[PDB]
PDB file of C-alpha atoms and ligand atoms in Angstrom:
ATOM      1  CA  UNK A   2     220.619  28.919 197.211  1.00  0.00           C
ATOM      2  CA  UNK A   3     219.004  32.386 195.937  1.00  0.00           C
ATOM      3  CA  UNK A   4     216.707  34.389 198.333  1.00  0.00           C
ATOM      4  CA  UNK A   5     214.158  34.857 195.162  1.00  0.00           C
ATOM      5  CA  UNK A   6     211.503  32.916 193.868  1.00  0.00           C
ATOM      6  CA  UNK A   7     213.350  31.475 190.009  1.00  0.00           C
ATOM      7  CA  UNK A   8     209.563  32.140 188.814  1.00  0.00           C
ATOM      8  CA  UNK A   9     208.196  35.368 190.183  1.00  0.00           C
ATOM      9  CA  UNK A  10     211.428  37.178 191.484  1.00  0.00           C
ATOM     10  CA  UNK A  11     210.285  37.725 195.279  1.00  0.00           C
ATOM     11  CA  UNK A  12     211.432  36.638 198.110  1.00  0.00           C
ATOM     12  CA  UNK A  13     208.556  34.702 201.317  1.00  0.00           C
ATOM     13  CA  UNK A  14     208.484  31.000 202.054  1.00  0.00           C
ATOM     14  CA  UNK A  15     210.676  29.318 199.692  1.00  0.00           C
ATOM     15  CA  UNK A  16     212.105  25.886 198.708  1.00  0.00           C
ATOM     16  CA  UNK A  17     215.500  25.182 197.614  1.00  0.00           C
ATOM     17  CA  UNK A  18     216.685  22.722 195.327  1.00  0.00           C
ATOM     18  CA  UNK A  19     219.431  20.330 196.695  1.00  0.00           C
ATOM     19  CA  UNK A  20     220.864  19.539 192.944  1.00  0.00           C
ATOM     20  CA  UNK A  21     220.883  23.501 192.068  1.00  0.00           C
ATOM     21  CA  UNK A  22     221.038  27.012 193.884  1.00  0.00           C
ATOM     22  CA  UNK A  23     216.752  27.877 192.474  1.00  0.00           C
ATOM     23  CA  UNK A  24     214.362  28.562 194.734  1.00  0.00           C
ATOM     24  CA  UNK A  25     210.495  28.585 194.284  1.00  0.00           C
ATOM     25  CA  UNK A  26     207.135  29.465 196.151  1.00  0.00           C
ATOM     26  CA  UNK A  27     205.741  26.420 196.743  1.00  0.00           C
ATOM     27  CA  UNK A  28     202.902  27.107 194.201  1.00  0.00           C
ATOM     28  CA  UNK A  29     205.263  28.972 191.345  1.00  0.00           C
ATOM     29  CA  UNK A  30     206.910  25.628 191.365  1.00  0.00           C
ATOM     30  CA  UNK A  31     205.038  22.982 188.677  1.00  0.00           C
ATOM     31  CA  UNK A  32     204.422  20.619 190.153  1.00  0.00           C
ATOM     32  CA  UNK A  33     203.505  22.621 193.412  1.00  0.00           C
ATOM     33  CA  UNK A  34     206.284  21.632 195.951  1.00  0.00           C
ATOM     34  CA  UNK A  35     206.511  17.957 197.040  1.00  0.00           C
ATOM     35  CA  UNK A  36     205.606  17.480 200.848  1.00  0.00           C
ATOM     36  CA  UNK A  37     208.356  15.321 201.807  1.00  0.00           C
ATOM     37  CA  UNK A  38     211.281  14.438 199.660  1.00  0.00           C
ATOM     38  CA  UNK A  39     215.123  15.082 201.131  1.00  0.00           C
ATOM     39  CA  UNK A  40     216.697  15.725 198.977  1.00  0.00           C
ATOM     40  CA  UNK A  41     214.477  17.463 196.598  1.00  0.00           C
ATOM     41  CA  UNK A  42     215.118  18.011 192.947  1.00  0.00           C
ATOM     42  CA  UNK A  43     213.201  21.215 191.199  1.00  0.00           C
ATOM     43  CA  UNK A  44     212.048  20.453 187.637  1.00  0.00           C
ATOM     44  CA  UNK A  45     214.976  22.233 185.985  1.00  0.00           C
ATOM     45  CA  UNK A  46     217.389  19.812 187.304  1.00  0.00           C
ATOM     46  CA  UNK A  47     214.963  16.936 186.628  1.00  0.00           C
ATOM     47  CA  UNK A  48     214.616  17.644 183.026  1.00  0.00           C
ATOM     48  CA  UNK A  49     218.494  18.105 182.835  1.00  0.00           C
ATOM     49  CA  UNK A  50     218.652  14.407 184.215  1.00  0.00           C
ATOM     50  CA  UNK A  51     216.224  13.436 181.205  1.00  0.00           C
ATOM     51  CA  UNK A  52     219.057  14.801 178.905  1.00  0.00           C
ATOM     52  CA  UNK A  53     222.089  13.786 180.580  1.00  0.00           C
ATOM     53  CA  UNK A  54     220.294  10.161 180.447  1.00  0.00           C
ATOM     54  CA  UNK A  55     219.470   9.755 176.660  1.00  0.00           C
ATOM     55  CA  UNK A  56     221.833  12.526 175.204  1.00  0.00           C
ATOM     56  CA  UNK A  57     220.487  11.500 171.356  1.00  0.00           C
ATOM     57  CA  UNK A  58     217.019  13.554 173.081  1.00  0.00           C
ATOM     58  CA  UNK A  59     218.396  16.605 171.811  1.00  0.00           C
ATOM     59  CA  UNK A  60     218.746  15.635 168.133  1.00  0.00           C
ATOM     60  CA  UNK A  61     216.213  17.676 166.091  1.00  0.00           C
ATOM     61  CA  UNK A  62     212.795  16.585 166.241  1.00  0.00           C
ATOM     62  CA  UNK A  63     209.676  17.294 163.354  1.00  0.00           C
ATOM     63  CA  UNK A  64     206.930  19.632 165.767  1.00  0.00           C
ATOM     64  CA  UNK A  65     203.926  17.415 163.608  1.00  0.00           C
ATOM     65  CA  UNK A  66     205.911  13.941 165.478  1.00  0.00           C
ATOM     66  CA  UNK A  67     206.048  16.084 169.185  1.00  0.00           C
ATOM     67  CA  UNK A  68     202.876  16.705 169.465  1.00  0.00           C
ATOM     68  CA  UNK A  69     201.470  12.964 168.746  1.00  0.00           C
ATOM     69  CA  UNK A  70     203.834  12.009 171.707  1.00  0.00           C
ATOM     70  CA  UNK A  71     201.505  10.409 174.362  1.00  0.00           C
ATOM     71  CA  UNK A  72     201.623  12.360 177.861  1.00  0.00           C
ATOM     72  CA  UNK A  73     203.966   9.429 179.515  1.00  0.00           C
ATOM     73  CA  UNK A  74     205.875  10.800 182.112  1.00  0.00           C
ATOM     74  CA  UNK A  75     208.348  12.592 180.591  1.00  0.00           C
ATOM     75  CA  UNK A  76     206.623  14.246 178.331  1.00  0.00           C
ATOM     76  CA  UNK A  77     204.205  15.388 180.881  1.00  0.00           C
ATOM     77  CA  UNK A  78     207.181  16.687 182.587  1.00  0.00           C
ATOM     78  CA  UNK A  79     208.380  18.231 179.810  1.00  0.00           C
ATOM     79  CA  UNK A  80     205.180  20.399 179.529  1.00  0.00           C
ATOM     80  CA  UNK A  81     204.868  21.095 182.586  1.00  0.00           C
ATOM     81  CA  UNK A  82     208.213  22.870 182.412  1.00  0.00           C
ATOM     82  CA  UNK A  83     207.901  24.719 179.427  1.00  0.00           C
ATOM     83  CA  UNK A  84     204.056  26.455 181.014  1.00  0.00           C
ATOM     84  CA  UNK A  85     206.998  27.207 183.814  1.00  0.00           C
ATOM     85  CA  UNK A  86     208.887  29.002 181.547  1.00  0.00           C
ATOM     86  CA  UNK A  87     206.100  31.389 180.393  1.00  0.00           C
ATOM     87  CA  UNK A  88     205.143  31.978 184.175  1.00  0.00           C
ATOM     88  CA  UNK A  89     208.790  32.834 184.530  1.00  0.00           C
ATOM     89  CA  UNK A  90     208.296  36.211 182.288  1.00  0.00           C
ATOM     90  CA  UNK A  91     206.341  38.795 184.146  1.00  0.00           C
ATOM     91  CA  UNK A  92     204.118  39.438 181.487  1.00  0.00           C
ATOM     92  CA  UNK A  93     202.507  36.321 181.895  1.00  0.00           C
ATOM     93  CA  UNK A  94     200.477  37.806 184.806  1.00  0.00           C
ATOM     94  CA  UNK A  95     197.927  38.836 181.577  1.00  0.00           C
ATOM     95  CA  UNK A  96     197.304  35.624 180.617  1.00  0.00           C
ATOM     96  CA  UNK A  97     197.314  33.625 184.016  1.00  0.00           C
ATOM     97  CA  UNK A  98     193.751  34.038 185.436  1.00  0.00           C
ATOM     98  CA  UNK A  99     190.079  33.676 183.656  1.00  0.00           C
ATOM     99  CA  UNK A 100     189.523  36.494 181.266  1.00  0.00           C
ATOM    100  CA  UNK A 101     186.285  38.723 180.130  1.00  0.00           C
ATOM    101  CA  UNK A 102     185.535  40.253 176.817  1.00  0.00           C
ATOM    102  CA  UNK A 103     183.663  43.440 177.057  1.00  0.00           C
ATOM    103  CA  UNK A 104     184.970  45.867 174.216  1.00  0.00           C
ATOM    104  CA  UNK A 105     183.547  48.168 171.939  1.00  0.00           C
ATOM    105  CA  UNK A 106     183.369  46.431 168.741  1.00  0.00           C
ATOM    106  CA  UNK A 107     185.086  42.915 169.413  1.00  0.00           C
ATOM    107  CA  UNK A 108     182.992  39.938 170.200  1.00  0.00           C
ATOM    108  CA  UNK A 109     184.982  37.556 173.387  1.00  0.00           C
ATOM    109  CA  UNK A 110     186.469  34.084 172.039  1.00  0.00           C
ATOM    110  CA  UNK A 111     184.099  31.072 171.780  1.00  0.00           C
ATOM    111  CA  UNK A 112     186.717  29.243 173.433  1.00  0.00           C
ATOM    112  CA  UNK A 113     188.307  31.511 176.212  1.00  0.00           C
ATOM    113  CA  UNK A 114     191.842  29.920 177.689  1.00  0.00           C
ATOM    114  CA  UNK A 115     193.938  31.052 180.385  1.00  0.00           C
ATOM    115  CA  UNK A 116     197.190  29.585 182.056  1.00  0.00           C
ATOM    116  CA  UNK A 117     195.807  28.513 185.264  1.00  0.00           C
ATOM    117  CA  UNK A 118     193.193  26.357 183.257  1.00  0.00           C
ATOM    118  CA  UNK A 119     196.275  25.140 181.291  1.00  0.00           C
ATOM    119  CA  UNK A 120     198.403  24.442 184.859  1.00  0.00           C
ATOM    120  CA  UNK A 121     194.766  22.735 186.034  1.00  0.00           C
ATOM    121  CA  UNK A 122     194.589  20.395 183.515  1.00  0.00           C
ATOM    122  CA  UNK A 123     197.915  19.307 184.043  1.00  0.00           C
ATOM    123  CA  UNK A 124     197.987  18.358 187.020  1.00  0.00           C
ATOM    124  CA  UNK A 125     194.549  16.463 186.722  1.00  0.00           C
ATOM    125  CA  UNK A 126     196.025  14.667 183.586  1.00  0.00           C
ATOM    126  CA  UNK A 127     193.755  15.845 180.919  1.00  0.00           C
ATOM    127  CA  UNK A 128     196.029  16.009 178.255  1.00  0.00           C
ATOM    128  CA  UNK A 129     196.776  12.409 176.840  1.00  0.00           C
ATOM    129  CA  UNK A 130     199.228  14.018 173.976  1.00  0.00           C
ATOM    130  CA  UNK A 131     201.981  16.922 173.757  1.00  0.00           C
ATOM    131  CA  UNK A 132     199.285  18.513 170.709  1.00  0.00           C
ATOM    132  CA  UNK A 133     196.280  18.720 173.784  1.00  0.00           C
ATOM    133  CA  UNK A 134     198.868  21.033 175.709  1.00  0.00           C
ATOM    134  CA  UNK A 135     200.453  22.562 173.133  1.00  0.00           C
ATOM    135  CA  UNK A 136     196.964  23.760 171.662  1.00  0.00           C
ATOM    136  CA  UNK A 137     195.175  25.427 174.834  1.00  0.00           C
ATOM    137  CA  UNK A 138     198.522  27.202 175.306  1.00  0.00           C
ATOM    138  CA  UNK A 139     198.555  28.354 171.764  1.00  0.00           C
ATOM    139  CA  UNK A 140     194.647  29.412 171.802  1.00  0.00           C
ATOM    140  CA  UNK A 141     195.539  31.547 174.894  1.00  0.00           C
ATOM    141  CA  UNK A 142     197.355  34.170 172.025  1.00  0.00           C
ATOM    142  CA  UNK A 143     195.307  33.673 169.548  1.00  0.00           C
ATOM    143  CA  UNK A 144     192.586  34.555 171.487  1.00  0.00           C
ATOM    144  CA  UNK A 145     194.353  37.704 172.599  1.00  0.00           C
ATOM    145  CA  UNK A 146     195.230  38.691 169.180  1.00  0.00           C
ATOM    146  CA  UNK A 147     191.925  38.358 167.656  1.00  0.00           C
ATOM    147  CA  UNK A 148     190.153  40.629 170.843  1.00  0.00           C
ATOM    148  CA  UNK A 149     192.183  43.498 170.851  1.00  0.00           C
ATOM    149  CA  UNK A 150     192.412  43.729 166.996  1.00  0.00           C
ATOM    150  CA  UNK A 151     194.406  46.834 166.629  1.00  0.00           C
ATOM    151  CA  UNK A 152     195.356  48.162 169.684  1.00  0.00           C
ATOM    152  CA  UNK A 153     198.855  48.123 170.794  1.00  0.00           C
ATOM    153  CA  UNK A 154     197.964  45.758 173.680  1.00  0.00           C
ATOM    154  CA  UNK A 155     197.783  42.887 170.791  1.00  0.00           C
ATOM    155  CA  UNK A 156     201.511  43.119 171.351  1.00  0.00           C
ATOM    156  CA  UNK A 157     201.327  41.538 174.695  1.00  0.00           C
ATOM    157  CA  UNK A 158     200.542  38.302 173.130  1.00  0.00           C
ATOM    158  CA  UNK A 159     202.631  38.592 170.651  1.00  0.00           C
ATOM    159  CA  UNK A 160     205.747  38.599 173.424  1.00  0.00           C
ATOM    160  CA  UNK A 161     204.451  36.154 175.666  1.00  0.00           C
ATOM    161  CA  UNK A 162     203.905  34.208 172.467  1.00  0.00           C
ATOM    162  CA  UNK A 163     207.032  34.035 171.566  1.00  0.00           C
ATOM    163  CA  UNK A 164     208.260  33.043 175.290  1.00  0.00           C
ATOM    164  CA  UNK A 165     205.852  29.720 174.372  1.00  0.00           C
ATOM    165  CA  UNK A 166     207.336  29.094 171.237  1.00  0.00           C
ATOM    166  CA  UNK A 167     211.493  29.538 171.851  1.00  0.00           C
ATOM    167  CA  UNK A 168     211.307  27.820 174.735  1.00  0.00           C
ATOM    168  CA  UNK A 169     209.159  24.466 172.539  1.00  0.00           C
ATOM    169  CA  UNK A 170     211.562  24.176 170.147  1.00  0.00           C
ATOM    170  CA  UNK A 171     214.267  24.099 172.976  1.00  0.00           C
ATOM    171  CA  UNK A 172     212.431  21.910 175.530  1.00  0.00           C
ATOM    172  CA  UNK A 173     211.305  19.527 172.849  1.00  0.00           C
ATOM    173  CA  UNK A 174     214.536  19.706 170.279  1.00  0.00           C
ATOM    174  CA  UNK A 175     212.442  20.895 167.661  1.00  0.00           C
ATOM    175  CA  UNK A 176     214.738  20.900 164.335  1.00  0.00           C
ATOM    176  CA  UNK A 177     216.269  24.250 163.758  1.00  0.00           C
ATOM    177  CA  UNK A 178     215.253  25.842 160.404  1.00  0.00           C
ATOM    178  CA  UNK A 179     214.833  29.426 158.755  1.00  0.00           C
TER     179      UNK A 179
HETATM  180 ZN1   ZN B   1     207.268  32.654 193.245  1.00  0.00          ZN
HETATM  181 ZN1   ZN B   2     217.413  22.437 190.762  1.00  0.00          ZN
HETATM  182 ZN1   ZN B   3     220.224   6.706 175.246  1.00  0.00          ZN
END
């Protein structure tokens, strides 16, 4: 197994996967680590499973059919892996805790978002479809964008913007188009 955390990069107390060489922190992990379990699967080999199982899943989807899904299982899985995937880049650390708005001439974001809200709400199951998930994640950019206007730190959501979206259209199948 690695020595590093597959989210964060550091090493401390981790857990390793019996299915694959990743390791996590016990809370960089979503779902935070299960107590017992041996062996233990981490959530990259337990949406590989989902594939391997129903191999037709990775047919191109339409994004408007996606997000209708109902939160069943899998697709709460599902989301719960991609909001890994954006805590995997290190510029996530922007968007992860509660923001505040306090800059000359921009007004804060009637709704403010935030990934730890977003990795709340999962695990309390407040999203009954992929579009409840898929939204708050998408407000956390557009929130960013609007703020800082034009200053160069718009670009920040921007990139971790496009960490969301790649990583959609792969996790979900999402129909490749130009
Ligand atoms: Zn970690
Ligand atoms: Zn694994
Ligand atoms: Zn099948």
């Amino acid at each position: 197994n690695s020595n590093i955390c597959e989210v964060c990069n550091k090493w401390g107390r981790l857990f390793c996967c019996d299915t694959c060489p990743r390791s996590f922190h016990e809370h960089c992990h979503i779902p935070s680590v299960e107590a017992n379990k041996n062996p233990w699967s981490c959530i990259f080999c337990r949406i590989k499973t989902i594939q391997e199982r129903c191999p037709e899943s990775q047919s191109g989807h339409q994004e408007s059919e996606v997000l209708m899904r109902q939160m069943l299982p899998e697709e709460q899985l599902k989301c719960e892996f991609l909001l890994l995937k954006v805590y995997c880049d290190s510029k996530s650390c922007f968007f992860a805790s509660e923001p505040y708005y306090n800059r000359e001439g921009s007004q804060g974001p009637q709704k403010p978002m935030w990934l730890n809200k977003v990795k709340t709400s999962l695990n309390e199951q407040m999203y009954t479809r992929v579009e409840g998930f898929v939204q708050d994640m998408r407000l956390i950019f557009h929130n960013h964008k609007e703020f800082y206007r034009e200053d160069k730190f718009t670009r920040l959501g921007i990139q971790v913007q496009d960490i969301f979206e790649k990583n959609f259209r792969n996790i979900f199948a999402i129909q490749e188009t130009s």
